[PDB]
Amino acid sequence: SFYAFFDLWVKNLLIDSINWKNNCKCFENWAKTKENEWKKVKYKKLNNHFQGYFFHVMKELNKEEKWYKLMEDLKEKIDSSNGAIKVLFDHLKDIAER
């Protein structure tokens, strides 16, 4: 279905973003690739900073310090900016420029 494909895509994007947060030219080319794949796809699911994707991500992740680090980074990115995908891609842009 379309919703299952969307959950698979957001799940794999979060898993690969977690793996990339733990080579900067290949990562910036990766984040440019996923952001162009976001425009062909584009809110209960993407509400603030990906709360509801937790069990989907840690079916395959199983290390909650990675999830807590991602949630803290997205929360401080939201606090610095002051839907959820754009906050992630601006957060992944700050990692890639370092």
Epitope: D7, Q51, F55, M58, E64, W67
Partner: antibody
Framework: VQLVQSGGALVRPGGSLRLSCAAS????????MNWVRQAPGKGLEWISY????????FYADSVEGRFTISRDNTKNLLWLEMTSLRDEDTAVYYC??????????????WGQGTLVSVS | IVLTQSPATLSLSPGEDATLSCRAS??????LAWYQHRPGQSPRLLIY???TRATGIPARFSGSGSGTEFTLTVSSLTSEDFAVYYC????????????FGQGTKVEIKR
């Protein structure tokens, strides 16, 4: 394996209450925790969830903004800080343990029950 | 996902087999559990994948169902099997939901 709660308490509406759920016999850090609410003559109703660490915390739609689940995995205590209690929160509060596996979101072993009644 | 316990109150003699149901409004899968709220006691988990059996549960608690129709079959009803049985979906959708049923009830018929 045992989950011992704090016992019931009488609270005025609009007040606050801190439930407790002391676990024993297993590793508290390795298990996800839950809060399940049963009103008199209404049936079971999940209200809260917390993960192995505080990385994820989920609430029912009727309890968001009012209740807060917290855990202390070195003291083996699970709390539910209750705030702005209405008249529909007179219920029995159950402390449940989740099975290993984040997909299997079931309630394996339960607490003794805690009748919270508002007046 | 809306879960409907059609049997509700069930007048059945002890020592007999009792079948139940838990109809889901949406396609859930194998992500459904079953519970037993014995009177004067906490609930306990019986089945956690709509077919399996939890640890510490006798083999007479068996279930089936993988789509929208689910069924718990308890056999040889003892004194403690006359309880209220709940069914919970834990479907892997976003946001995650923990939805129970109304609670079917098994009672002694006379």
């Amino acid at each position: 394996v045992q989950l011992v709660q704090s016992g019931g308490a009488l609270v005025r509406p609009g007040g606050s209450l801190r439930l407790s759920c002391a676990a024993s016999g297993f590793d508290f850090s390795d298990f996800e925790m839950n809060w399940v609410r049963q009103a008199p003559g209404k049936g079971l109703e999940w209200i809260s969830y917390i993960s192995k660490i505080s990385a994820a915390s989920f609430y029912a739609d009727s309890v968001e903004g009012r209740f807060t689940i917290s855990r202390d995995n070195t003291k083996n205590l699970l709390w539910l800080e209750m705030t702005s209690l209405r008249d529909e929160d007179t219920a029995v509060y159950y402390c449940a343990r989740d099975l290993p596996g984040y997909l299997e979101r079931v309630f394996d072993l339960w607490g003794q029950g805690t009748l919270v009644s508002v007046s | 996902i809306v879960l409907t316990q059609s049997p509700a109150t069930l007048s059945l003699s002890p020592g007999e087999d009792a079948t139940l149901s838990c109809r889901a409004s949406q396609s859930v899968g194998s992500a459904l559990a079953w519970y037993q709220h014995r009177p004067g006691q906490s609930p306990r988990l019986l089945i956690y994948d709509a077919s399996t059996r939890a640890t510490g549960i006798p083999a007479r608690f068996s279930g089936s169902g993988s789509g929208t129709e689910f069924t718990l079959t308890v056999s040889s009803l003892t004194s403690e099997d006359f309880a209220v049985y709940y069914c919970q979906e834990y479907k892997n959708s976003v946001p995650p939901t923990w939805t129970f049923g109304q609670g079917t009830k098994v009672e002694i018929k006379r």
